[PDB]
C-alpha cells in the first residue's frame, strides 16, 4: 500500500489520492487482470510477433531441403546415380554442377540468417532496456510503458520471447473552468507554488494539475514577486492569512 504511494508521487499527484480511494483502485486493478484473462484465452491473434519468428525460420529450412532435388544444370539430381551411369573421367563435370548449385544454395541461407539474427538482437536489447527501467523502477519517458502516465509493469515468459503487463493511469472525465495565470492582492503578483488558479464563477481556487481538488488560497499556497502591472491576465482576489486569527487567540 505504501509502494503504490511511492508511485503516485511521480506523476504530479499528491499522496492523498490513494488511501482515500483504496477500495476503488483495488477492484479496478483486479477487474483489469480479468480482462487480460478473457482476451488472451478467446482469440489466438494476440501473439502475432512471436509466431512470425518460427514461421520465417521454418520457411528457410523447407526452402533449403527442397533444393536437394534440382539438377542445377546437370542431367540428374542424385549423387549415386550420376556415378553409375556416366564414366568418372566425365562424371566429374556433371558432379561439378552439383557443387556450385548446392554451395550457392547454402551461402544464400546463411546470409539470410545473419541479417535476420541482427533483427533479434535489436529487439533483445530493447527488451533488456525495458526490464531495467520499466520493471526495476518507474519511467518518465512518454509513451514508453504503454499509452499514459506510468505506474509499474510485470514480466511474463513466453516460448522464445517475453510478454509484459503494463499498468498505466488515464484520466476519465473533464470539466470546464475559468483561469487566470496570476493573482493580485496588494498590488503584487501571487504566483502559485504548485498548481493553477481556477474559478467556477464566484470564488477562486487553487488545485493540482491532474485531479480536481480545490483549496482556499493562503499565504503558504503562493510566493510573491513583482508589482501588479507587468503581468497580462491579472485578476484580483483576497489571500487569507492564517497567522492573524491564530495570533488573535
Ligand X SMILES: *[C@@H]1O[C@H](CO)[C@@H](O[C@@H]2O[C@H](CO)[C@@H](O)[C@H](O)[C@H]2NC(C)=O)[C@H](O)[C@H]1NC(C)=O
Instruction: Tell whether residue 100 is a contact of ligand X (CB under 6 A).
Output: no
Residue (110 or 247) nearer to other proteins, CB: 110
Residue (2 or 232) nearer to ligand NAG, CB: 232
Residue (115 or 232) nearer to ligand NAG, CB: 232
How many Å apart are CA 235 and CA 184, to the nearest integer? 6
Residue (174 or 248) nearer to ligand NAG, CB: 174
Residues 158-177 that bind ligand X (CB under 6 A): 172
Distances (CA, A) of 213 to 109, 184, 196, 209: 63, 22, 11, 9
Q: For the residues of 2-32, what is the DSSP string, one character each?
A: HHHHHHHTTTT--THHHHHTHHHHHHHHHHH
Q: Tell me how far, at minimum, the Cβ of 249 lies from other proteins, in Å.
A: 35
Q: Which does 1 bind (CB under 5 to 8 A by kind): other proteins, ligand NAG, ligand X, none?
A: other proteins
Q: Which of 9, 133, 138, 198 binds other proteins (CB under 8 A)?
A: 198
The residue behind cell 484520466 is 171
Instruction: Tell whether residue 215 is a contact of other proteins (CB under 8 A).
Output: no
Instruction: Tell whether residue 202 is a contact of other proteins (CB under 8 A).
Output: no
Residue (24 or 172) nearer to ligand NAG, CB: 172
Q: Which of 16, 70, 236, 238 binds ligand X (CB under 6 A)?
A: 236
Q: Tell me how far, at minimum, the Cβ of 200 lies from ligand X, in Å.
A: 4
Q: Tell me how far, at minimum, the Cβ of 72 lies from ligand NAG, in Å.
A: 43
Could you give the string, one character per residue 187-226, with x where binding to ligand X holds by CB under 6 A and - elsewhere?
A: -------------xxxx-----------------------
Q: Which does 200 bind (CB under 5 to 8 A by kind): ligand X, other proteins, ligand NAG, none?
A: ligand X
Contact 62, 54 (CB under 8 A): no
Distances (CA, A) of 233 to 180, 223, 229: 6, 18, 10
Contact 180, 235 (CB under 8 A): yes
Question: Using CA atoms in the order 131, 133, 134, 140, what is the torsion angle rounded to 10 degrees?
Answer: -160
Q: What stretch of H or E contains 236? A: strand 235-236
Rg of the chain on CA atoms, in Å: 35
Could you give the string, one character per residue 105-124, with x where binding to other proteins holds by CB under 8 A and - elsewhere?
A: xxxx-xx-xxxxxxxxxxxx
18-55: b (≥16 Cβ within 10 Å) or e: beeeeeeeeeeeeeeeeeeeeeeeeeeeeeeeeeebee
The residue behind cell 501473439 is 47
Task: Supply 242's cell numbers.
Answer: 492564517
Where on the chain is the footprint of ligand NAG (CB under 6 A)? 174, 176, 232-233
Interacting residues with ligand X (CB under 6 A):
24, 27-28, 172, 184, 200-203, 236
Amino acid at each position: 500500500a505504501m509502494q503504490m504511494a511511492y508511485r503516485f508521487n511521480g506523476i504530479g499527484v499528491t499522496q492523498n489520492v490513494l488511501y482515500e480511494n483504496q477500495k476503488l483502485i483495488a477492484n479496478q486493478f483486479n477487474s483489469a487482470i480479468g480482462k487480460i484473462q478473457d482476451s488472451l484465452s478467446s482469440t489466438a491473434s494476440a501473439l502475432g510477433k512471436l509466431q512470425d519468428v518460427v514461421n520465417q525460420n521454418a520457411q528457410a529450412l523447407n526452402t533449403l531441403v527442397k533444393q536437394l532435388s534440382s539438377n542445377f544444370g546437370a542431367i540428374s539430381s542424385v549423387l549415386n546415380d550420376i556415378l553409375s551411369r556416366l564414366d568418372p573421367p566425365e562424371a566429374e563435370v556433371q558432379i561439378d554442377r552439383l557443387i556450385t548449385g548446392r554451395l550457392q544454395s547454402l551461402q544464400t541461407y546463411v546470409t539470410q540468417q545473419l541479417i535476420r539474427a541482427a533483427e533479434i538482437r535489436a529487439s533483445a536489447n530493447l527488451a533488456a532496456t525495458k526490464m531495467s527501467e520499466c520493471v526495476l523502477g518507474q519511467s518518465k519517458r512518454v509513451d514508453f510503458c504503454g499509452k499514459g502516465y506510468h505506474l509499474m509493469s510485470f514480466p511474463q515468459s513466453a516460448p522464445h520471447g517475453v510478454v509484459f503487463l503494463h499498468v498505466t493511469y488515464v484520466p476519465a472525465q473533464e470539466k470546464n473552468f475559468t483561469t487566470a495565470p496570476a493573482i493580485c492582492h496588494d498590488g503584487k503578483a501571487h504566483f502559485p507554488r504548485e498548481g493553477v488558479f481556477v474559478s467556477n464563477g464566484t470564488h477562486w481556487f487553487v488545485t493540482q494539475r491532474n485531479f480536481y481538488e480545490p483549496q482556499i488560497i493562503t499565504t503558504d499556497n503562493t510566493f510573491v514577486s513583482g508589482n501588479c502591472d507587468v503581468v497580462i491576465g491579472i485578476v484580483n482576489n483576497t489571500v487569507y492569512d492564517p497567522l492573524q486569527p491564530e495570533l488573535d487567540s
